[PDB]
C-alpha cells in the first residue's frame, strides 16, 4: 500500500497516504514521470503534515511531467548520502549520485543528511591562528584553525578569485581531507575547479558535492546538508581534520525562501521565509570543531544590492568567527582582494592570542583608516589641501596603507599574468609598523599597488 499525488505547485507536491501509514518528516519518497525524454524518478522530501493523512513534500528534481494520481512510495528514511574514505576523489550531487561514475557509491555506507548538532558539552572554542599569506587577512582578520570563516560581498567583487586563492593557501598543503560544497554557484566554476584540482593533483584528497544554479530550490537547499554529512563523517568516524569549503551559502537561504513561498507560509520582512534564522542555525551549528577534532570552514556569502542590512547576511553574521567583507567601492579603486578593513573582523585579534606587536599595529592601522574614512566627506569636495597638517600627514600615509593592503594573489595570475606572492606574518607586521611610523611616506602611492612584501616594494619603487 502506498500514497497518491493530489496537488502540484512547482516543485512542491502534496501526497495522500492511507490512514495509518503517513511518513515521518524529512522522509524520502519516490514518484515516476513517464512523459518521454523528460521521464525520471522524482525524490520528494516531506516538509509538512497537512492533516487528513495528507503531507506536503519538496521535490529534489523538476516536477515537469508529473501528473496527478500517480503512486508514491515511502522509503522510510531520510535522503542518504555515501560516506567513507572512498568518497574522496569523486564528484557527487545532493542525492548521492556520482557524476563522474554513475554507479559509484551505491555499495558504500550511507548516512542520513538530517542529523542533530553536537552536544553543547562537546564544544570547545578554538584560538590557534591560521596563516594564509595575505597581508590584510593575516593582519586585521586572522583566521582560526578549526573555526568558521566567511567571505561576504556583492556581485562581481571577488568571491571566486579569493576562494580558489584560499584553496591554494590552505588546501594545497593541508594534511587532512577536504570537502567542497557548491551551493548554488555557477556550474562553469565547478568544472573549472574539477579540472584545476586534478592539474594540481589535490583531487585525490578532496570530495566535491555540487548543487549548481540550474537545480530547483528543493535540492539547492539540501546540497549543503549533503556535503556537511560527509564532512562530519570524516570528522567523527575517521578522526581526520577537515576543510569544508561552501560557496555560496546565501543561496541556501534563498532556496529556503523559494520553497517557503510555495509551502504557503506567510512572508517575513523584505520577503524571506520565517524560521530563516532557525534553518541557517540548524545548518551552521553542525559545522563546528568538537573537542579533540577540527573542521575548518570557509564560506562565501552573497549580498544582494550590496545591502549589508539584508536579513540573510545579517543573520549569518552571528555564526562566524572570521568575517572578511568585500566592498564595491574598494574594488572600484583598483584595490584587490578589495577587503574592507573597517567592516571585516576576527574574534581572535586580541593580544592574548596574537601578541602585542601584532595587536598594536592592527589597531593603529584601523585608527588611521578610520580617520581617513571620516575625512572622506571633505576630501570629496575640497581635496586634501584644505585639511590641517595633523590630518594631511595622516591621510597621506592612510592612502598608502590602504593601497599596500592589496596583494598579487596566485589565482589572479590567469588574468593579469603577474605571478603570485606569499608573505610571512612577521614581514607584514614589520611593513605596516614602518608604514604607520612613516618610514615609507616618501614613495608615491602607485608604487604600493599589488606588491607583496617589502623587498618587492623596494624593487617596484626603484623602477618608478
Amino acid at each position: 500500500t502506498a500514497g497518491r499525488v493530489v496537488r502540484i505547485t512547482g516543485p512542491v507536491v502534496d501526497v495522500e497516504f492511507p490512514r495509518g501509514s503517513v511518513p515521518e518528516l524529512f522522509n524520502a519518497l519516490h514518484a515516476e514521470i513517464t512523459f518521454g525524454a523528460l521521464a525520471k524518478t522524482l525524490t520528494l522530501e516531506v516538509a509538512q503534515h497537512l492533516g487528513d493523512s495528507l503531507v506536503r513534500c519538496i521535490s529534489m528534481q523538476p516536477t515537469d511531467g508529473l501528473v496527478r494520481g500517480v503512486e508514491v512510495t515511502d522509503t522510510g528514511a531520510s535522503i542518504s548520502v555515501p560516506v567513507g574514505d572512498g568518497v574522496k576523489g569523486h564528484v557527487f550531487n545532493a542525492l548521492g549520485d556520482c557524476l563522474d561514475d554513475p554507479g559509484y557509491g551505491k555499495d558504500f555506507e550511507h548516512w542520513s543528511i538530517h542529523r542533530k548538532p553536537p552536544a553543547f558539552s562537546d564544544l570547545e572554542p578554538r584560538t590557534e591562528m591560521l596563516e594564509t599569506g595575505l597581508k590584510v587577512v593575516d593582519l586585521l582578520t586572522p583566521y582560526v584553525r578549526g573555526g568558521k570563516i566567511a567571505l561576504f560581498g556583492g556581485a562581481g567583487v571577488g568571491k571566486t578569485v579569493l576562494i580558489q586563492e584560499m584553496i591554494n593557501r590552505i588546501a594545497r598543503n593541508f594534511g587532512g581531507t577536504s570537502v567542497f560544497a557548491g551551493v548554488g554557484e555557477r556550474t562553469r566554476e565547478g568544472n573549472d575547479l574539477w579540472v584545476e584540482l586534478a592539474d594540481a593533483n589535490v583531487l585525490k584528497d578532496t570530495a566535491l558535492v555540487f548543487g549548481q544554479m540550474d537545480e530547483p530550490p528543493g535540492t539547492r537547499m539540501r546540497v549543503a546538508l549533503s556535503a556537511l554529512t560527509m564532512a562530519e563523517f570524516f570528522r567523527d568516524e575517521q578522526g581526520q581534520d577537515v576543510l569544508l569549503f561552501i560557496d555560496n551559502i546565501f543561496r541556501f537561504t534563498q532556496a529556503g525562501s523559494e520553497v517557503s513561498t510555495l509551502l504557503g507560509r506567510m512572508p517575513s520582512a523584505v520577503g524571506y521565509q520565517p524560521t530563516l534564522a532557525d534553518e541557517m542555525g540548524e545548518l551552521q551549528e553542525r559545522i563546528t570543531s568538537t573537542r579533540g577534532r577540527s573542521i575548518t570552514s570557509m564560506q562565501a556569502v552573497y549580498v544582494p544590492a550590496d545591502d549589508y542590512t539584508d536579513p540573510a547576511p545579517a543573520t549569518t553574521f552571528a555564526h562566524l568567527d572570521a568575517t572578511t567583507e568585500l566592498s564595491r567601492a574598494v574594488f572600484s579603486k583598483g584595490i584587490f582582494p578589495a577587503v574592507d578593513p573597517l567592516a571585516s573582523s576576527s574574534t581572535i585579534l586580541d593580544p592574548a592570542i596574537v601578541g602585542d606587536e601584532h595587536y598594536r599595529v592592527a589597531q593603529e592601522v584601523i585608527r588611521i583608516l578610520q580617520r581617513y574614512k571620516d575625512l572622506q566627506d571633505i576630501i570629496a569636495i575640497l581635496g586634501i589641501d584644505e585639511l590641517s597638517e595633523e590630518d594631511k600627514q595622516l591621510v597621506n600615509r592612510a592612502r598608502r596603507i590602504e593601497r599596500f593592503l592589496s596583494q598579487n594573489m596566485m589565482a589572479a595570475e590567469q588574468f593579469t599574468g603577474q605571478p603570485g606572492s606569499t608573505v610571512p606574518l612577521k614581514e607584514t607586521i614589520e611593513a605596516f609598523d614602518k608604514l604607520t611610523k612613516g618610514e615609507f611616506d616618501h614613495l608615491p602611492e602607485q608604487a604600493f599597488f599589488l606588491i607583496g612584501g617589502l623587498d618587492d616594494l623596494a624593487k617596484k619603487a626603484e623602477s618608478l
Binding site: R265, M266, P267, S268, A269, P274, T275, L276, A277, D278
Partner: protein, 49 residues
Amino acid sequence: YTGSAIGQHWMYNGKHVLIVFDDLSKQADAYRAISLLLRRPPGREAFPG
C-alpha cells in the same frame, strides 16, 4: 522569560540578581517567526503586532 523567572525567585527571596539578555533582537526575530507560523497578521516591518 525563564531567565527572568530564575531571577525573580532569588529576587523575591531577598537576594540581589543581575540579568543579561544577549540579545533581545533575536527574541524579536523568534517571536516574529512563531507568530507568522501561527498566521497572525503582522504589523510594521513584519514584526508581530
